[PDB]
Design a binder for this molecule. Structure first.
Ligand SMILES: O=c1ccn([C@@H]2O[C@H](CO)[C@@H](O)[C@H]2O)c(=O)[nH]1
Ligand SMILES: O=c1ccn([C@@H]2O[C@H](CO)[C@@H](O)[C@H]2O)c(=O)[nH]1
Lengths: 290, 290
């Protein structure tokens, strides 16, 4: 039922300089692979079959990462690294396609989603903001649950995360009557950007994971330039409120913002430790520090 | 006076896959910046003025990193973010030049250095393998001490460090009568590549920093192949021994192989704990795991 995801990757990422001066922020090493691999894997495991990169002319390396590399593959055969060759050959399953479209100028998350209008078609679709990483624990990730909730209700889904009461002015927080249980959705009635401490309508932050109906593309074509003179996804979802129910899905797992330098380092530590091959020896490198 | 360093960066480096799949192994992010910045900083802080990259068709992103990026810089001006702008424009001082030459085919380290012949001319020169990072704690870095010593002695220098007896198996090892002290050089008879664990002439590994005379280039033209990697540098250094004193310089610093997954994870930890801004907040994140 939900088979397409739009990853908007066209932004230059001024927040993680100089690391992203000359390679995309999305290709920042996290333990042993680029950040984007963790987001694409997340999508794939939630049953996504078509990855739609809305990208920029400097971001070839993202596209090259999900494609074959002749010179790389033949030097791996020449060195008999057959296991590695099989790992870099099958980064993504056979049935998963990676499509690419250009965002002409950088005019907001809303405008980036709109650039995928022609590939989304009449299909309903997920959005995953790739600067955010999502870590699970049990089987079936937060995006899987949210998608099957969109399928159940036919209500737009907006992934949210409880944050401490003293911090809500850093986040977009949703207006909900009550807060749902982890793994569950509630009707929401708007999102407020960076509300002042003591005046926010919930502790539930917008994360950067959406499931939206195609209808939203028509709504983005009729939303005026908002905050930062940029055309805004939150403003098109406000408009969707006029005809459709919109729910906040509260995640069971934990996020990392590989857009800040400190959220990046947090992610390396948490992914490092959990690494199926390096985790133990990484923990050991930690201990030996002091 | 040693002004020129050769950085052989032409090899694909299949040991830090998949990080290095679609970006150069040299651009892999260490804390907040590509690994190669640490190596170019090492050279410049030790009086280098011409950085000679011996490079490959797939590594523009390295050249770009020490160049200016028009679209990114104006994006930063428009957004009035001038402290970031300063961190991406003054990456090396005005007086330091970064030069490119192509290694046509990957025929070994010696062939890389020989590709730099036309640029180095009649001048003496440093060689830096950027896969290895070298961290100081004195205020004079090991490359500086080793150049300072080439200048007096007029003896070629090979940076070396002591390894556990059971691992001499893994490393280039120098033939020395005796171990110099941390910070000094002894005469050396040559290098044994991966000596059998019992039968090595010392515990002192070749680290990947050299200071060599111009005439090594003629020598490199008249060395045959070695380990099916046409020209080998150590063969040329042996050929040098039949004319001049060659010395082994033992380092006071510490090393990290950013090609080995654990060596890279160790550089992230150590370099992060000592970052101006993030060190204290990073130290903080590490404690919050136990
Ligand atoms: O105009 C654009 C195009 C893309 N993105 C992407 O959306 C996320 C932040 O909103 C990041 O992944 C960024 O690269 C934007 O934000 N704005
Ligand atoms: O043919 C070769 C062999 C090695 N190297 C470089 O030498 C260093 C150590 O072998 C690495 O950074 C590798 O890229 C080259 O540039 N070309």
């Amino acid at each position: 039922m939900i088979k397409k995801a739009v990853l908007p990757v066209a932004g230059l990422g001024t927040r993680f300089l100089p690391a992203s001066k000359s390679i995309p922020k999305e290709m920042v090493t996290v333990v042993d692979r680029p950040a984007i691999e963790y987001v694409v894997r997340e999508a794939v495991e939630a049953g996504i079959e078509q990855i739609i990169l809305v990208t920029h002319s400097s971001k070839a390396s993202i596209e090259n990462y999900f494609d074959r590399n002749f010179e790389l593959e033949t030097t791996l055969e020449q060195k008999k690294k057959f296991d590695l060759l099989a790992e870099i050959t099958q980064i993504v399953p056979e049935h998963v396609s990676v499509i690419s479209v250009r965002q002409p100028q950088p005019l907001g998350l809303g405008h980036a989603v709109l650039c995928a209008k022609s590939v989304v078609g009449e299909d309903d679709f997920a959005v995953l903001l790739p600067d955010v990483l999502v870590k699970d624990g049990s089987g079936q990730n937060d995006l899987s649950r949210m998608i099957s909730r969109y399928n159940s209700s036919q209500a737009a889904q907006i992934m949210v995360e409880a944050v401490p009461d003293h911090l809500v002015d850093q986040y977009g927080i949703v207006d909900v009557a009550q807060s749902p249980n982890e793994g569950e959705s509630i009707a929401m009635q708007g999102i407020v950007e960076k509300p002042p401490v003591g005046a926010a309508p919930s502790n539930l932050s917008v994360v950067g994971r959406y499931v939206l109906p195609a209808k939203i593309m028509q709504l983005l074509e009729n939303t005026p330039k908002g905050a930062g003179n940029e055309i805004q996804l939150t403003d098109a979802i406000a408009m969707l409120q006029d005809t459709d129910t919109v729910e906040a899905y509260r995640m069971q797992g934990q996020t990392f913002d590989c857009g800040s330098k400190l959220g990046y380092l947090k992610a390396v530590l948490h992914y490092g430790l959990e690494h199926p091959k390096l985790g133990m020896e990484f923990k050991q490198l930690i201990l030996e520090l002091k």
